[PDB]
Amino acid sequence: GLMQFTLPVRLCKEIELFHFDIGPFENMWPGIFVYMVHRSCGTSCFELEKLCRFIMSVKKNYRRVPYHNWKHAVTVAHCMYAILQNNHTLFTDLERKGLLIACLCHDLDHRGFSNSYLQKFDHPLAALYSTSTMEQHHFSQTVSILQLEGHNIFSTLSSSEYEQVLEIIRKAIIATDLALYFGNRKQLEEMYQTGSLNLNNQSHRDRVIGLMMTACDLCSVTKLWPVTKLTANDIYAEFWAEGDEMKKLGIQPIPMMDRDKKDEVPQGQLGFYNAVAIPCYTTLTQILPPTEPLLKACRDNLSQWEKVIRGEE
Ligand SMILES: N#Cc1c(N)nc2ccccc2c1O[C@@H]1C=CCCC1
């Protein structure tokens, strides 16, 4: 009850910043997450015995892949924590509970392959879920871990609050499917500009929560350059392995995923920053002004990639 998590001074201060890196000590990541829940939600939101048991079952069900791993989970939850903390009064008690859990669970049991590679492989999950394949699996895995004896962190919610939080978590996880992001942001853009955006409209909140999920999910591009640059290697290690598996199915993969065309990476990152990241954090900053530091950090890193291309690094 009176048991708080406390971090060392440096972390205690840096954790509040959007660009915080959770560090290379795996065994500190659960405490960092519980720290964030206690400050974000309250020391009462979850029974600490059950939260700790949920966190360690979630960790167990992330694989040892180069990027879509436990570190990503906690990193993406931290970005959500930063957004929620800089936007105190915009979110309900249920939304703060749900979204941190959504982010921790959003890539559960990821194998390091796109929905595209599952479809071309003819993976069983591609037959069970025709669209947002992995994301439907991630939500499924979340519900399974919640239903293990002693793991129901939401037990003390009423029936309707329980239904609401699981529905917040389902939409949040589905939205991390980047194929759905383009349309979601376009719609949010129009609604913002025509002035029809309304946070009392549930369908509008859903869309805004989805953009938040994309923003947390891509938050590697909003870190200090050395973190951004080193994470990019982890992302590309998966892409190139997927490229390899495409070649095993007798399919030339797009040049981004082909490990013979590494030269093309910096230009590939420009496309990604201009086509995805900058638009994402632009619309997010328009809807939630205090998330501006994400857009700024993302612009700083675009410029750093421009410098890589111009031979300057
Ligand atoms: N972050 C990031 C990131 C990145 N730095 N670079 C990319 C380049 C091309 C396509 C996707 C890219 C990407 O997308 C996430 C990584 C893997 C799949 C989920 C979306």
Ligand SMILES: [Mg+2]
């Ligand atoms: Mg994902």
Ligand SMILES: [Zn+2]
């Ligand atoms: Zn992710």
